Design an enzyme around this catalytic site. Structure first.
Site, PDB file in Angstrom:
ATOM      1  N   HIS A 238     -13.520   2.797   0.902  1.00  0.00           N
ATOM      2  CA  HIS A 238     -13.514   1.653   1.831  1.00  0.00           C
ATOM      3  C   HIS A 238     -14.188   0.425   1.213  1.00  0.00           C
ATOM      4  O   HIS A 238     -14.659  -0.460   1.928  1.00  0.00           O
ATOM      5  CB  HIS A 238     -14.175   2.001   3.179  1.00  0.00           C
TER       6      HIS A 238
ATOM      7  N   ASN B  95       0.826  -1.200   0.000  1.00  0.00           N
ATOM      8  CA  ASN B  95       0.000   0.000   0.000  1.00  0.00           C
ATOM      9  C   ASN B  95       0.864   1.257   0.000  1.00  0.00           C
ATOM     10  O   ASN B  95       1.496   1.591   1.006  1.00  0.00           O
ATOM     11  CB  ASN B  95      -0.965   0.002   1.192  1.00  0.00           C
TER      12      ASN B  95
ATOM     13  N   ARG C 198     -12.196  15.306   9.108  1.00  0.00           N
ATOM     14  CA  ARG C 198     -13.078  15.641   7.984  1.00  0.00           C
ATOM     15  C   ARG C 198     -14.478  16.036   8.445  1.00  0.00           C
ATOM     16  O   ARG C 198     -15.070  15.380   9.303  1.00  0.00           O
ATOM     17  CB  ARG C 198     -13.153  14.490   6.978  1.00  0.00           C
TER      18      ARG C 198
ATOM     19  N   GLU D 283      -8.201  -5.599   5.306  1.00  0.00           N
ATOM     20  CA  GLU D 283      -8.095  -5.197   3.908  1.00  0.00           C
ATOM     21  C   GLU D 283      -6.939  -5.893   3.197  1.00  0.00           C
ATOM     22  O   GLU D 283      -7.051  -6.230   2.019  1.00  0.00           O
ATOM     23  CB  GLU D 283      -8.008  -3.672   3.787  1.00  0.00           C
TER      24      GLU D 283
ATOM     25  N   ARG E 204      -2.637  -2.066  -3.549  1.00  0.00           N
ATOM     26  CA  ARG E 204      -3.800  -1.271  -3.195  1.00  0.00           C
ATOM     27  C   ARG E 204      -3.840  -0.024  -4.068  1.00  0.00           C
ATOM     28  O   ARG E 204      -2.898   0.771  -4.075  1.00  0.00           O
ATOM     29  CB  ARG E 204      -3.749  -0.890  -1.716  1.00  0.00           C
TER      30      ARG E 204
END
Lengths: 392, 392
Positions: free
Chosen positions: B170, B9, B231, B376, B81
């Site tokens: 996601h 990743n 966020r 993941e 990824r």
């Protein structure tokens, strides 16, 4: 003596007015002084023979039209529609110098419409100095919202110093419709959970728990929430920031696009009118189909989202131009909410708006669905009438 | 021979990696090459003894670290990824020159992370030319979304020419968790309705109908939807336009505020970490309380909103850092959803994450609530393993 209420709504380029009987709240006269600030201005009483100027000039014409109709002596109350009451107004009030000063304080929150409302107040005070005048706010009903419901995820300084927060609109409509729903659905106001879908050219959802507004879809401005006639509704801020780089448009450039060019008109590229889009879909037009489908999807999404502010859901109420008249939208929205166990009564949903306050859900439905025609001039008048008994 | 999968990743300033056994998907080695592009760069294998350069330099170090550990001969597959697959990628694929070309095409949709992913691919192809390599996308799972779910209310040209639409993120997590839920809840994949709440530093909701993603909370960018660590989540575009006039900030100035300075950190003015905020709330801090309450309110709002894309709701699944470990958030979110008839099992909800895949709802609950730890790297590996059988 049959006293009457003069209801005034001053827009950015128009003055809408109605005259309602105090006893019944029946409309006795209706009109619109359109084309304001321009040199060509026309007054249309009862939709016949347009006759041909600032905000005071247009109201002076209306006053002289009531003087020649011998109604000026019957005007016991004057109701004013105010676009934005900030955090200062939580209900309808009797207008004084203090109220005017305070409306001016919150006028930066809606610089377009609020100054027009103050112009309408200044003019009506000049023409009717002996008549009680009341202010009714679009925002006031949503002031019962908890901080968790009205705060945005922005830094705290934006809320504390700048006052950035959810205000919500159609509050007068949402209040009125909710009050009528307790009667129609035989509910106790203080033990109830309603979702009101106000669907018009501008559209908002409101969750009403125990008589109080607890969530609403519009934000600080009428731009947040549902997709509307020309309004986009909820839009990813990152996507807007992404567009600005690709197109070379500023924030103001994109605000006009979001407000004037988007929504049903934006996706379909045809009309903001659903009657046009429904026909086009049947005529095989795909972009009109998608516009409606997106419109419905986003309505379903917000109705269900707003229901999370309730402990028990008793009723979903449709109102406004679209909510009252669109058989298709109601069917699709309700069928998009099978997760809440809604069951539609198709034949009842087909009934035209002339049937007024009506149930559109079938018996096995877990939640009652209804249409209640909204009357904002009546709620203004009813607030004015109640405030008419005051000694101040 | 015990073959292994190397999962890579590449972030904007780091390369995270894991090594998983093909047979079991057990992590055999984990690390992070941090401080990329800067002159000071350090590799932390298994969280011990940091050793001290471009993207290829950091991967060449990892390759030499596996060469000295005698694992280079066991690497049968390499998983990558990818942050964004646009509309071009609907599933995990075997990397070829065509795939690379196509990832480059969609890289304007995420200019930061996607070019870093391509740098990781270019480097891994140089170091392991004989090893099969696969791409796994954050966006691909949400490509099953209907146009009504992914279109914004903007003019059609913004979608047709610029490609502005909801993508969601996601997706790898949402897919994995959903697959595990059918096992845990004994559900038929093809006859099911799930809501997956991925709650981490970045947070998103996803509705999964009959095994397919039908709604998700993030949009074109990871900025839309839920309020997160830093966020803001959903924010009125009119409010943002209102701020720009008052502060004199541009769109880029406000994008950084929305992304880096907002959310839990923004409201509380303390931390993006919930452990800090929970303690502060108990210590009497009000802004930490409000940050959590707003966080929960907006989660409840989206879970319920997303449920409208389902015909029947069978389960709500919590996952991610917050979803797995925060007893408080789960309790508050579930208690905020009494309208869906959720009943919490308090003692079960108190169980720590070590108990893995677990039910947190009581028996009378109309909808099953569960925690499923997300993995993941495993889903990347499982996609790689399945694509390992291919003859191309």
């Amino acid at each position: 003596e049959f006293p009457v209420v003069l209801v005034i709504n001053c827009g950015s380029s128009s003055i809408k007015f109605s005259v309602l009987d105090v006893a019944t709240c029946d409309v006795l006269m209706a009109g619109i002084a359109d084309g304001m600030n321009t040199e060509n201005a026309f007054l249309s009483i009862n939709g016949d023979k347009p006759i041909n100027s600032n905000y005071e000039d247009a109201l002076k014409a209306i006053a002289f039209e009531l003087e020649k109709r011998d109604l000026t002596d019957s005007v016991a109350l004057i109701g004013h529609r105010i676009a934005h009451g900030g955090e200062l107004f939580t209900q309808s009030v009797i207008i004084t110098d203090e109220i005017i000063d305070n409306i001016r304080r919150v006028s930066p929150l809606a610089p377009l419409h609020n100054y027009a409302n103050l112009s309408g107040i200044d003019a009506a005070r000049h023409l009717f100095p002996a008549v009680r005048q009341v202010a009714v706010f679009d925002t006031s009903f949503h002031q019962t919202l908890a901080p968790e419901a009205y705060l945005y995820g922005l830094p705290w300084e934006y809320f504390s110093s700048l006052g950035v927060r959810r205000y919500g609109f159609h509050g007068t409509s949402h209040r009125y419709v909710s009050r009528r729903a307790y009667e129609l659905l035989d509910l106790d106001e203080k033990d109830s959970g309603l979702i009101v879908a106000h669907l018009g050219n501008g559209a908002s959802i409101c969750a009403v728990r125990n008589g109080q507004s607890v969530d609403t879809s519009m934000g600080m401005t009428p731009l947040e929430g549902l997709m509307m006639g020309t309004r986009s509704g909820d839009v990813d801020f990152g996507a807007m920031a992404w567009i600005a780089k690709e197109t070379g448009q500023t924030l103001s450039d994109l605000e006009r696009v979001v407000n004037k060019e988007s929504g049903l008109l934006g996706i379909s590229g045809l009309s903001s009118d659903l009657r046009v889009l429904e026909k086009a879909w049947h005529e095989g037009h795909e972009r009109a189909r998608l516009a409606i489908k997106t419109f419905v999807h986003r309505i379903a999404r917000h109705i269900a989202g707003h229901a999370a502010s309730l402990h028990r859901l008793d009723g979903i109420i449709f109102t406004g131009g679209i909510g009252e008249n669109s058989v298709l939208i109601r069917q699709l929205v309700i069928e998009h909410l099978g997760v809440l166990g809604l069951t539609l009564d198709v034949e009842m949903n087909k009934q035209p708006n002339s049937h007024g306050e009506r149930i559109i859900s079938a018996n096995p439905s877990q939640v009652i669905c209804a249409v209640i025609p909204t009357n904002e001039e009546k709620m203004i008048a009813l607030d004015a009438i109640h405030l008419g008994n005051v000694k101040a």
